[PDB]
Design an enzyme around this catalytic site. Structure first.
Site: not given
Ligand SMILES: O[C@@H]1[C@@H](O)[C@H](O)OC[C@H]1O
Ligand code: NI
Length: 376
Positions: A65, A258
């Protein structure tokens, strides 16, 4: 019409009264604080003369990520040296040649390169790919691998769609509903992972055999977000089944870390491919929900808005994402207030700065009109 057509990017900060000089200084400062020599705020660490990585300060590990984020950031800032250091580290330590996930990238590694898992994280793969397409377009494909950018991007996207046909692997997108998955071996998603605007571009640069699929994925993701975001609050859960409802089996069915990226994604997609009634209304809902709430008090909320006692672990990231969302509703009633709040929010320090700061720099680039599409 989006910047994809006009090739002109909205500088929302400027439109909201900020001077071009202060905007330019702020963008550069944000960059230096993250990639420069600023121990208290930086998230990027150089290694040797050809390696580098972004550190998840809170979990003391390197995540695809972060690496994919770092690459996207580097190409946007036209810093091939940084891009190459990071990408080199990724291919050397994260790319898997063995196991059911061969062809993908280990989602978490120790700073010394050791793999913590052989499981991948799809949101990293999609960022790597676009970052690579942009690198190819801005600097050209390198002669020696893995610096042959466009080839690596198409290769990676091939695996993402076709894995499991010539072996035991699994695709990162469900071939039937065209929706990105949380991880290869499951049949549910993660709203923040949907990047229709990224797929639109993949429908132009990925292998031709998949261009139709990518156009379909972009459309499927846009529809998916409509059912995933709460109709009243606009809040999306971290994990969600294909049917749109939250997957709270492990506690990821609420509005938390998230989820924050949904508003940012909606904003960037609006700027790139055009605004939409739904996107504007969606951002108006989220921002409205936070209108009467103080940052120091941001909590984890059920998507219906019910507050948990637990505070937001990354309130600065939330601020950045809500602000970036203003791109999908420039005339929204809270748009200006969100942009101002972000402007008045300093880059984060501490061991939890990583996530906040990544969302922070992306918001800074997008809101200043510097998060662009790089064409061949
Ligand atoms: O990796 C990220 C982690 O650092 C943060 O704490 O929560 C969100 C994750 O995506
Ligand atoms: Ni100044």
């Amino acid at each position: 019409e989006g910047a994809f057509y006009t090739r002109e990017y909205r500088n929302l900060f400027k439109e909201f009264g900020y001077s071009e000089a202060e905007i330019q200084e702020r963008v550069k400062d944000t960059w230096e604080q993250l990639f420069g020599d600023n121990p208290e705020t930086k998230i990027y660490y150089e290694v040797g003369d050809d390696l580098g990585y972004l550190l998840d300060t809170g979990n003391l590990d390197v995540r695809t990520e972060g690496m994919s984020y770092g690459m996207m950031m580097a190409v946007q800032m036209d810093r091939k040296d940084i891009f190459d250091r990071i990408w080199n580290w990724t291919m050397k330590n994260m790319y898997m040649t063995e196991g059911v996930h061969a062809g993908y990238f280990a989602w978490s590694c120790q700073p010394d390169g050791t793999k913590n898992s052989w499981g991948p994280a799809p949101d990293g793969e999609e960022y790597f790919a676009l970052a690579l397409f942009f690198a190819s377009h801005r600097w050209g494909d390198g002669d020696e691998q893995p610096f042959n950018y466009s080839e690596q991007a198409r290769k990676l996207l091939h695996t993402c769609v076709h894995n499991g046909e010539g072996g035991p692997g699994h695709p990162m997108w469900n071939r039937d509903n065209k929706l990105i998955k949380f991880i290869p071996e499951v049949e549910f998603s993660d709203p923040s992972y949907h990047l229709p605007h990224f797929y639109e571009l993949f429908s132009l640069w990925a292998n031709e055999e998949d261009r139709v699929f990518w156009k379909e994925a972009a459309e499927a993701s846009r529809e998916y977000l409509k059912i995933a975001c709460h109709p009243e609050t606009g809040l999306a859960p971290e994990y969600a089944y294909y049917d749109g409802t939250p997957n709270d089996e492990k506690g990821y069915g609420h509005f938390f870390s998230d989820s924050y990226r949904v508003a940012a994604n909606i904003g960037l997609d609006a700027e790139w491919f055009g605004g939409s009634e739904w996107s504007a209304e969606e951002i108006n809902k989220i921002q409205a929900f936070f209108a009467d709430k103080e940052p120091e008090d941001y909590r984890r909320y059920k998507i219906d808005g019910e507050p948990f006692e637990e505070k937001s672990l990354h309130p600065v990231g939330l601020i950045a994402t809500n602000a970036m969302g203003s791109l999908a509703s420039v005339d929204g009633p809270y748009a200006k207030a969100n942009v101002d709040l972000f402007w008045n929010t300093p880059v984060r320090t501490g061991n939890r700065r990583y996530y906040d700061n990544c969302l922070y720099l992306f918001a800074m680039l997008a809101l200043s009109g510097n998060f662009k599409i790089w064409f061949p």
